[PDB]
Amino acid sequence: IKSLFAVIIGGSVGCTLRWLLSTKFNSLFPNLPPGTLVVNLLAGLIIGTALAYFLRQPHLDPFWKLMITTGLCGGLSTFAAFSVEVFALLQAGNYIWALTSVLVHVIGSLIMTALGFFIITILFA
Amino acid sequence: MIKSLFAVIIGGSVGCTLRWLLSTKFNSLFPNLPPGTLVVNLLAGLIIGTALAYFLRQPHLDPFWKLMITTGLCGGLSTFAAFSVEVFALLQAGNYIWALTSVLVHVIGSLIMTALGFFIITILF
Amino acid sequence: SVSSVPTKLEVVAATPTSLLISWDAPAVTVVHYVITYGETGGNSPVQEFTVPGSKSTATISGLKPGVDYTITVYTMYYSYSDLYSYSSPISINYRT
Amino acid sequence: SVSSVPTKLEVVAATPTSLLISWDAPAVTVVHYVITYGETGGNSPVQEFTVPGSKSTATISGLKPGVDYTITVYTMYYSYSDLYSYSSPISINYRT
Ligand SMILES: CCCCCCCCCCO[C@@H]1O[C@H](CO)[C@@H](O[C@H]2O[C@H](CO)[C@@H](O)[C@H](O)[C@H]2O)[C@H](O)[C@H]1O
Ligand SMILES: CCCCCCCCCCO[C@@H]1O[C@H](CO)[C@@H](O[C@H]2O[C@H](CO)[C@@H](O)[C@H](O)[C@H]2O)[C@H](O)[C@H]1O
Ligand SMILES: CCCCCCCCCCO[C@@H]1O[C@H](CO)[C@@H](O[C@H]2O[C@H](CO)[C@@H](O)[C@H](O)[C@H]2O)[C@H](O)[C@H]1O
Ligand SMILES: [Br-]
Ligand SMILES: [Br-]
Ligand code: NA
């Protein structure tokens, strides 16, 4: 029950952020909507740092780990929007940006996780 | 912007709690490509794809329900961060074959479930 | 707030029995365009055909010489809020 | 409900100064195993080194012939709930 509040409090902030970020920005470059991208990189950044930090503090309350990863990162990022955008571009005959959207999101959100992880790995050393 | 905010939170928490519950039950059952996170992304891929084609035929739907389904439920039910850590974890563990498989199955499987949801409903109507 | 409607719809080439129409795409992911045409004198049926979202021109053929036609073009586009929807039309009158 | 601790840890090949330890990997994604070993008796400094997760074996060297050693092995693994965390250890004795 206390864990369901971590997911709901953490996931509400993330869903709200992804919403405010996705409407205020997505329409500016329809070939690769940038609101659905920043939340995914920013959530990839946060999960990467969450990865390295939670390792060095094994005694953290699972409430705060749940709020940041399953809640915040989970709500903030989104596969659905990334699909319809790519599905929209495939149905529009825009194969080059469908492939680029896929390539950028995946290569990018991994690079943003490796960045968050090693920045904390390196700061602790 | 206050009513619009509730649609994102309600649908999102339902989406998030959903993703939380499904992920802790099934994720451990096959760690090379966790099935929990894979279902909520195929499911949301299905739900957004059907929402893609049903919203097209009902152009007078309250933006409250479209917001609660797409940005909230589909937005919260799905995640990109957990698919990034699981790929970054397979990479730091040298399971390169499965890291690549996880990228393909999520990207391709979620577009199919979006086309499935779209054309299943396009064909009904 | 980004307009989904095309702009500068115009007949760039004409014979007595065909029109080459063109337009300028909107600032949105456009999946396909619908071109609609028919006799302006509301005494004739309307025809519609899709063109891919990559094309910004279309040929209307089989027309009657010396007749006034209304030509309209609207989009089926992906936005973030509305997902798939149909934009309002841009319309021109043109006599062959 | 899936244990992160390795199982069936045994010295499989031995010489007077080295031990080849092997283990069964847990059904979790393991990033690296941590091998530790010290002289069973009392207060010798326990030494430890990491082995990549793809490997399930490890060689320990620089030991004195005729000494009882305590070789423990645990994991740095990824589970969905804890992200990166450490496992409880599995341990053996072996006298060279
Ligand atoms: C990596 C795999 C992911 C899963 C699979 C996703 C598949 C998504 C696209 C399916 O939808 C079709 O795409 C065609 C190509 O865009 C469109 O052709 C339309 O546009 C073409 C443009 O060349 C025209 O030639 C066609 O006549 C016209 O129907 C067609 O309408 C549309 O229904
Ligand atoms: C195309 C998208 C790219 C996005 C960015 C991807 C970044 C990936 C980072 C992976 O992190 C490294 O992975 C190595 C390989 O797994 C590990 O080597 C470890 O594992 C190897 C294989 O088991 C051993 O050979 C090494 O000695 C051992 O240090 C290493 O520790 C770890 O930090
Ligand atoms: C697009 C960019 C792609 C490349 C990204 C970087 C991949 C290579 C990393 C090289 O640096 C590594 O740093 C690790 C520490 O972070 C070391 O891990 C050592 O320590 C780790 C724990 O900190 C263990 O898990 C490892 O097995 C052990 O080799 C490892 O020796 C060292 O080489
Ligand atoms: Br997550
Ligand atoms: Br979404
Ligand atoms: Na989400």
Author numbering:
A (entry chain A): 2 to 126
B (entry chain B): 1 to 125
C (entry chain D), D (entry chain C): 1 to 96
Wording from the paper:
Microbes are protected from the cytoplasmic accumulation of environmental fluoride ion (F-) by export of the toxic anion via fluoride channels known as Flucs. These small, homodimeric ion channels are remarkable proteins in two regards: first, their unusual ‘dual-topology’ architecture, in which the two subunits of the homodimer are arranged antiparallel with respect to each other, yielding a double-barreled pair of pores related by twofold symmetry; second, the Flucs stand out among anion channels for their extreme substrate selectivity. In contrast to most characterized families of anion channels, which tend to be non-selective among anions and sometimes poorly discriminate against cations, the Flucs are arguably the most selective ion channels known, with >10,000-fold selectivity against the biologically abundant chloride. The protein possesses two deep, aqueous vestibules with an electropositive character due to an absolutely conserved arginine sidechain and a deeply buried sodium ion at the center of the protein.
In order to probe the role of the anion-coordinating sidechains in more detail, we mutated Fluc-Ec2’s bromide-coordinating Ser81 to alanine, threonine, or cysteine, and also constructed a S81A/T82A double mutant. For all four mutants, we measured fluoride channel activity using either single-channel electrophysiology or bulk liposome efflux experiments, and we solved x-ray crystal structures of the mutants together with Br-. The functional experiments showed that fluoride throughput is inhibited in these mutants. The S81A/T82A double mutant had a more severe effect, with fluoride throughput diminished to 8530 ± 30 s−1, a ~100-fold reduction in the rate. In accord with the fluoride transport experiments, a strong anomalous peak persisted in the S81A structure but was weaker in the S81A/T82A double mutant. In both cases, the densities shifted away from the channel center toward the external solution, moving about 2 Å closer to the vestibule Arg22s.
